[PDB]
């Protein structure tokens, strides 16, 4: 259950070493730098639009890592290891490891920003006085909304792929292919939306 994540880790590490050695401003962008850079530009632009860079500079690397670490782990599961691999996000542990860390980080930011005494009050009061009772619950619903989202979206696939296995091979080749084709795009979407939601939670926490 861990090795499936460690593989994605070593993959992204090697990719970062490749970029480090290759990247140049003198020459062409043909190398991998077009992926790392195509992610960095979108994340930079989103955070600059929402919160502005200098108010919250450190959230860019966090966003790009919580994007790639999810994207690679979702896509690599498409390979025909059906038999040993399994999408690590199919286990609650991975989803919590991401979501509760994002939670503690943005709340620590709220504390550093507004202070330990004032930030709780700002979280409880919310945008409306009578909304405050529901605001104190939304404050905890947000991270569950980050976690269960990934968990369900990848576990439905981890289940359907094992369900389709009860057909014979000749019948089986069609639905497995259709589902994995669907899952590539849907996993990309659910990683992008996780990174965007992280950026937005920070946006409404730093203010």
């Amino acid at each position: 259950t861990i090795l499936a994540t460690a593989v994605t880790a070593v993959i992204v590490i090697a990719l970062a070493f490749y970029l480090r050695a290759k990247v140049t401003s003198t020459g062409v962008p043909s190398g991998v730098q077009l992926f790392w850079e195509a992610l960095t530009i979108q994340m930079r632009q989103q955070i600059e639009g929402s919160i502005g860079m200098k108010i919250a500079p450190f959230v860019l690397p966090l966003s790009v890592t919580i994007f790639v670490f999810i994207l690679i782990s979702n896509w690599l599961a498409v390979l025909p290891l059906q038999y040993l691999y399994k999408a690590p996000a199919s286990d609650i542990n991975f989803v919590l490891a991401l979501a509760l860390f994002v939670f503690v980080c943005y709340h620590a930011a709220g504390i550093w920003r507004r202070g330990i005494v004032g930030h709780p009050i700002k979280v409880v009061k919310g945008h409306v006085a009578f909304l405050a009772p529901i605001n104190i619950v939304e404050e905890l619903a947000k991270p569950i909304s980050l976690a269960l989202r990934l968990f369900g979206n990848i576990f439905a696939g981890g289940i359907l792929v094992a369900l389709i296995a009860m057909f014979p091979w000749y019948i089986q080749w069609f639905p497995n292919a259709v589902w994995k084709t669907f899952d590539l795009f849907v996993g990309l979407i659910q990683a992008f939306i996780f990174s965007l939601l992280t950026i937005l939670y920070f946006s409404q926490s730093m203010e």
Binding site: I2, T5, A9, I13, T24, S25, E37, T40, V64
Partner: protein
């Protein structure tokens, strides 16, 4: 049969650790060079 898959196991801390080291490695090697490169590329424009 059935394992009540909702309840977390010990693997949680390990996945967190192997995410954290990835985050640090990225923040160092991916982002500084690329931001420098993107800034210079904008100066080229």
């Amino acid at each position: 049969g059935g394992s009540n898959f909702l309840i977390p196991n010990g693997t949680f801390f390990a996945v967190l650790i192997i995410f954290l080291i990835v985050l640090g490695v990225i923040s160092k090697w991916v982002v500084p060079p690329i931001s420098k490169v993107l800034a210079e590329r904008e100066a080229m424009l």
